[PDB]
Ligand binder design. Structure first.
Ligand SMILES: [Ca+2]
Ligand SMILES: [Ca+2]
Ligand SMILES: [Ca+2]
Ligand SMILES: [Zn+2]
Lengths: 544, 63
């Protein structure tokens, strides 16, 4: 007959932070999943406003984390959707850090990851103030680069600009491939979300969307990598002979050289410049024309020279990025040529190559294996003419793969989309999986896909064994000691901000936040690009 | 069994537990875990640089 609700209760303020309560230290989005992992016996938990008011009472459920071989307790507070600042209080354990629930919760993190790219620029001075700390360096590598290894002549050809790759300052075409392709696909996949975004970059007042300004800085370097002979072959990297010391980049005066071509670098150049051509055309159509003409020169080379060719890196001991095969790279090039230009020849090249992939979509992918990028662009194209059976084969594999990633994250004690798989750079892959999930969601809308993408993000922001953000400058107890030369050489205690560290391996507890650990604690453009894609989907996003 | 030199440390192959192949940003490497006074260490060497004995362990692990 009669129902009236009990008064809201407030918490006693004796709750202390406990490192066993592991959650996304940035926060959550209304109408999406919200979970914490509690590595301690518990039952009841409360979600508490910053003022002490209890808004939710739940029961944590036990789960075995096969990765760390521990029983953990999962607190699901997904039903809390009101925007605000909260913490989780776990009687008998303690409390979590404070977190936010907001539709725009990830926008600052997106902007900071973008700042990391800005701060990796080569050939120019860079300067930014981040949380009151001034990070800067003077113009570096302004004498890029010499041709001695290309044609024997000690001739300089401009190869400035672009991004420093990692914790070293050298610039590698093959790693640029996945980086630029993943960032360009963030642009295409989330264009209405990213087009209005203003960034803290020097290009903030020109007529180009700021996300694309950052990418142009890299394409400007990429464009310099074709051989001067006009063959269309693409130099593998611009590099010093050996890895330099932990010095600021403007203090590195050793000569830098173009390194002999690879077929994969050539294919990656085609894909990047073909994408650049269609993406830049509305804003800098002269540059777009330059990009497509360059793409065509190199694609003609690849058509006439089908063999896989590894770069001759004799004389160098810096990064190799020697992808084992160019078949994926050539598939991606054909897809992008087709998407930009539409010619039947490109479509036929792509479809013939795609048919030779037994598994059309791979869950675990990175610079060495870029075929997913082509599959995504082909599947999502609005162009007519696609073979229906190939389309269906790619769709089936995409959805099967996405469903498997959801199953992995759902059955992992920390929602890790990559499961028990650890290797050098795996943190990058955790977030790169959001590409498969978001593309799956475009083809077959499914909340599980979007929530799994948020599980990948949550994992790198503190819902993990270590209870730490893996991104410099963000979240709970971020990495302080990346293998990063600017960080090591400047006079600042905190490292340069916005970088996703590579991750521990072979095991789930093997990450070490120490500068000597290039194996686990470096930074990289391909890792940031994956994080950028992951966060991009949640910029100017409304989940109602 | 022979000594594996890696960046400069030396590990007898008799101490190596798991061996596997990885294409890293630095090039193709043979990675491995090993016994270090009762802890488990991790190391890696260029594939082109690995002794026959380590490459045999890799082949077995891969078969
Ligand atoms: Ca702009
Ligand atoms: Ca490849
Ligand atoms: Ca520092
Ligand atoms: Zn530089």
């Amino acid at each position: 007959l009669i129902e009236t609700k009990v008064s809201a209760a407030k918490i006693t303020e004796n709750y202390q932070f406990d490192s066993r309560i592991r959650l996304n230290s940035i926060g959550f989005i209304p109408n999406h999943s919200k979970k914490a992992t509690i590595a301690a016996n518990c039952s009841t938990f409360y979600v508490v406003k910053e003022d002490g008011t209890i808004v939710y009472t739940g029961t944590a459920t036990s789960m075995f984390d096969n990765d760390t071989k521990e029983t953990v307790y999962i607190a699901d507070f997904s039903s809390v959707n009101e925007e605000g600042t909260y913490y989780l209080a776990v009687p008998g354990v303690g409390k979590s850090v404070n977190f936010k629930i907001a539709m725009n919760v990830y926008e600052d993190a997106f902007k900071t990851a973008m700042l990391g790219m800005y701060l990796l620029r080569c050939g120019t001075s860079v300067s930014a103030t981040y949380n009151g700390i001034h990070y800067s360096h003077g113009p570096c590598h302004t004498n890029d680069a010499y041709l001695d290894y290309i044609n024997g002549q000690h001739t300089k050809k401009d190869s400035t600009k672009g991004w420093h790759d990692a914790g070293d300052y050298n610039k590698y075409v093959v790693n640029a491939g996945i980086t630029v392709g993943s960032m360009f696909l963030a642009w295409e996949h989330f264009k209405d979300q990213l087009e209005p975004v203003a960034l803290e970059i020097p290009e903030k007042n020109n007529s180009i969307p700021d996300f694309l300004d950052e990418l142009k800085y890299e394409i400007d370097w990429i464009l310099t990598m074709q051989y001067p002979d006009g063959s269309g072959r693409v130099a593998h990297k611009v590099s010093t002979r050996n890895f330099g010391g932990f010095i600021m980049p403007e203090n590195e005066h050793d000569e830098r050289f173009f390194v002999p071509w690879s077929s994969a670098a050539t294919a990656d150049f085609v894909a990047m410049t073909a994408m650049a051509a269609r993406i830049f055309r509305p804003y800098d159509p002269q540059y777009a024309e330059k990009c497509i003409n360059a793409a065509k020169v190199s694609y003609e080379f690849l058509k006439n020279n089908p063999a896989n060719v590894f770069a001759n890196q004799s004389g160098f001991s810096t990064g190799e990025y020697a992808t084992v095969s160019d078949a994926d790279d050539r598939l991606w090039a054909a897809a992008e040529m087709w998407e930009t230009l539409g010619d039947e020849e490109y479509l036929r090249d792509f479809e013939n190559r795609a048919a030779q992939f037994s598994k059309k979509i791979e869950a675990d992918f990175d610079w060495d294996n870029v075929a997913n990028l082509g599959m995504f662009t082909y599947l999502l194209s609005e162009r007519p003419g696609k073979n229906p059976a190939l389309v269906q084969s790619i769709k089936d594999s995409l959805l099967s793969t996405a469903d498997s990633i959801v199953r992995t994250s759902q059955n992992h004690g920390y929602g890790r989309t990559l499961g028990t798989t650890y290797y050098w750079g795996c943190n990058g892959t955790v977030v790169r999986q959001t590409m498969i999930l978001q593309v799956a969601n475009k083809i077959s809308p499914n909340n599980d896909y979007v929530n799994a993408a948020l599980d990948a993000i949550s994992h790198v922001f503190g819902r993990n064994y270590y209870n730490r953000s893996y991104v410099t400058g963000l979240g709970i107890n971020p990495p302080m000691n990346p293998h990063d030369r600017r960080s090591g050489a400047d006079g600042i205690w905190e490292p340069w901000p916005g970088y996703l560290v590579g991750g521990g391996w072979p095991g789930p507890k093997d990450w070490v936040d120490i500068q000597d650990s290039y194996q686990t604690n470096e930074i990289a453009i391909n890792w940031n690009a994956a994080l950028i894609y992951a966060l991009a989907g949640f910029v100017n996003y409304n989940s109602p | 069994s022979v000594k594996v030199k890696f960046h400069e440390k030396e590990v007898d192959t008799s101490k190596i537990k798991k061996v596997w192949r990885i294409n890293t940003r630095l090039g193709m490497r043979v990675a491995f875990t090993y016994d270090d006074n009762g802890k488990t260490g991790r190391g890696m060497v260029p594939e082109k640089d690995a002794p026959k004995e380590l490459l045999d362990m890799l082949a077995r692990a891969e078969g």
